[PDB]
Amino acid sequence: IIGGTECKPHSRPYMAYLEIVTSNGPSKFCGGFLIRRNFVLTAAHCAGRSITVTLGAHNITEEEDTWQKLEVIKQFRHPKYNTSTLHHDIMLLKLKEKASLTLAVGTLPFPSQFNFVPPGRMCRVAGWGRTGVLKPGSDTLQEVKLRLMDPQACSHFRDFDHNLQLCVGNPRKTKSAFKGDSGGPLLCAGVAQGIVSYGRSDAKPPAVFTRISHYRPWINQILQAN
Amino acid sequence: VTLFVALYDYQADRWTDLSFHKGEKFQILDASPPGDWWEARSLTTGETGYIPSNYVAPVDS
């Protein structure tokens, strides 16, 4: 998160910190969010051989009693995900066990297909990602408020599709989701509307978010069968 | 089968993508999804991200 502030600890109890491993080499990290006691939503591009989710965290370097660290047992990457367009950058993660609902660990409501969110409104996103192009990832959960932009503001992203994607962050400001925030939720007036997908390497906003409402049928299909 | 080399320098424009120099080597991690890009790990930097298939070739080609 660039230009954000430290979250009040545990104030976003659906947040999931994902550590993604592929044999021997270093791990990668993403955000995500708890939508059922045993399901986490994140971005498709965060997939990997094995994934550990940490729930109940604030400072990800300091174990605490609020932590519930759970292994992912199955990954459901959207079947139409494509790496040229990054369309359908969405994935569900089934956890080995159901999380315990506590003040620090809870689920986030996801939208009906009709609830289609429009340009000009301010939304919030949180994450543990980098705080600048050449800055470290953040040990503490950070949040920032960003403007939903018209699709034209995202015209330089390959085949930006307003039905599938949200365009997020006023280009006149430096405030933005960034590397390591992928998979985190975008909330608009307390309701989850987007998932951080991708943006510019140089951190110039806006960035592209998956529009969750479009995917409600697919999400329902996975949740019903699993 | 997963050890590749950059044929050219590349500067990334999406934050999901690796930048790299000609001759840098990669382990290809996932090439299943359709698209111009495969997920790879740089052996030089240890970073994971997408690389464009048309910038790379197997080390033994």
In chain B the domains, ranked by start, together with CATH numbers, are 1-61 (2.30.30.40)
What's the token pair of residue A25? 């080499």
Contact A53, A105 (CB under 8 A): no
DSSP 8-state assignment for residue B28 = E
Contact A208, A199 (CB under 8 A): yes
| Cβ neighbours of residue B15 closer than 8 Å, sequence gap 6 or more | A178, A179, A198, A199, A200, A201, A203
Q: How many angstroms separate the CA atoms of B44 and B39, rounded?
A: 15
The C-alpha of A200 sits at a distance from chain B's nearest C-alpha, in angstroms, of 5
Expressed in angstroms, the distance from the first to the final Cα of chain B is 11
Strand residues in A68-108 grouped as ranges (E): 68-77, 91-95
Q: Respond yes or no on whether the N-terminal peptide bond of residue A119 is cis (omega within 30° of 0).
A: no
Q: In which domain, by residue range, is A149 found?
A: 1-12+108-213
Q: Contacts of residue B34 in chain A, CB cutoff 8 Å?
A: 82-84
A87 is catalytic: no
Q: How many angstroms separate the CA atoms of A85 and A95, rounded?
A: 28
| Cβ neighbours of residue A209 closer than 8 Å, sequence gap 6 or more | A125, A165, A166, A167, A168, A177, A186, A194, A195, A196, A197
Are A87 and A166 within one domain? no
Q: How many angstroms separate the CA atoms of A193 and B41, rounded?
A: 31
A45 is catalytic: yes
Of A45, A87, A88, A214, which one is the catalytic site residue? Answer: A45
Q: Contacts of residue B15 in chain A, CB cutoff 8 Å?
A: 178-179, 198-201, 203
What single letter denotes the amino acid at residue A160?
Answer: F
Contact A165, A208 (CB under 8 A): yes
Are A169 and A77 within one domain? no
Q: Which of B3, B11, B14 to mutate to test the interface with A (most CBs of A within 10 A)?
A: B14
Are A114 and A72 within one domain? no
3-state secondary structure of A134: coil
Of A89, A181, A213, A214, which one is the catalytic site residue? Answer: A89
Compute CA A178 distance to the chain's CA centroid, rounded to the nearest angstrom: 11
What single letter denotes the amino acid at residue B6?
Answer: A
Q: How many angstroms separate the CA atoms of A186 and A184, rounded?
A: 7
Q: What is the structure's resolution, reported in angstroms to one decimal?
A: 1.5
Residue with tokens 């997920």: B39
Of A159, A139, A162, A146, the residue nearest A206 (C-alpha): A146
3-state secondary structure of A188: strand
**Cβ within 8 Å, pair B36-A199:** no
Q: Contacts of residue B11 in chain A, CB cutoff 8 Å?
A: 201
CATH value at residue A33: 2.40.10.10
Are A165 and A221 within one domain? no
3-state secondary structure of A216: helix
What's the token pair of residue A102? 């506590």
Contact B46, A25 (CB under 8 A): yes
Are A7 and A77 within one domain? no
3-state secondary structure of B49: strand
What's the token pair of residue A148? 């939903």
Contact A48, A32 (CB under 8 A): no
**Cβ within 8 Å, pair A84-B48:** no
Q: How many angstroms separate the CA atoms of A143 and A31, rounded?
A: 12
Element (H, E) at A223: helix A216-225
A182 is catalytic: yes
Q: How many angstroms separate the CA atoms of A147 and B42, rounded?
A: 35
Are A75 and A132 within one domain? no
Are A41 and A131 within one domain? no
Contact A168, A205 (CB under 8 A): yes
Are A6 and A115 within one domain? yes
What's the token pair of residue A131? 């705080």
The C-alpha of B20 sits at a distance from chain A's nearest C-alpha, in angstroms, of 13
- Give A44: exposed, middle or buried? Use CB within 10 Å, 0-12, 13-18, 19+: buried
Of B29, B21, B35, the residue nearest B3 (C-alpha): B29
Candidate from B12, B34, B47 with C-beta closest to A201: B12
Are A120 and A170 within one domain? yes
Q: After which residues is chain B broken (C to N over 2.5 A)?
A: none
Compute CA B24 distance to the chain's CA centroid, rounded to the nearest angstrom: 9
Contact A82, A88 (CB under 8 A): yes
Distances (CA, A) of A26 to A75, A133, A180: 20, 20, 14
What's the token pair of residue A177? 């989701």
| β pairing state of A165-168 and A185-188 | unpaired
DSSP 8-state assignment for residue A154 = G
- Phi and psi (nearest 5°) for A222? -70, -45
Question: How many C-alpha atoms does A184 have within 13 Å on its Cβ side?
Answer: 30
Are A76 and A147 within one domain? no
The number of folded domains in chain A is: 2
What single letter denotes the amino acid at residue B3?
Answer: L
Contact A2, A131 (CB under 8 A): yes
Are A61 and A128 within one domain? no
The C-alpha of B32 sits at a distance from chain A's nearest C-alpha, in angstroms, of 10
Experimental approach: X-ray
Candidate from A22, A85, A201 with C-beta closest to B29: A22
Compute CA A79 distance to the chain's CA centroid, rounded to the nearest angstrom: 19
Are A198 and A155 within one domain? yes
Contact B42, B24 (CB under 8 A): yes
What length does chain A have?
226
Q: How many angstroms separate the CA atoms of A213 and B6, rounded?
A: 39
- Hey, how many other C-beta atoms are within 10 angstroms of the C-beta on B45? 14
- Give A133: exposed, middle or buried? Use CB within 10 Å, 0-12, 13-18, 19+: middle
Compute CA A181 distance to the chain's CA centroid, rounded to the nearest angstrom: 6
Q: How many angstroms separate the CA atoms of A78 and A90, rounded?
A: 6
Calculate ∠ Cα A208-A211-A215, nearest 5°: 140
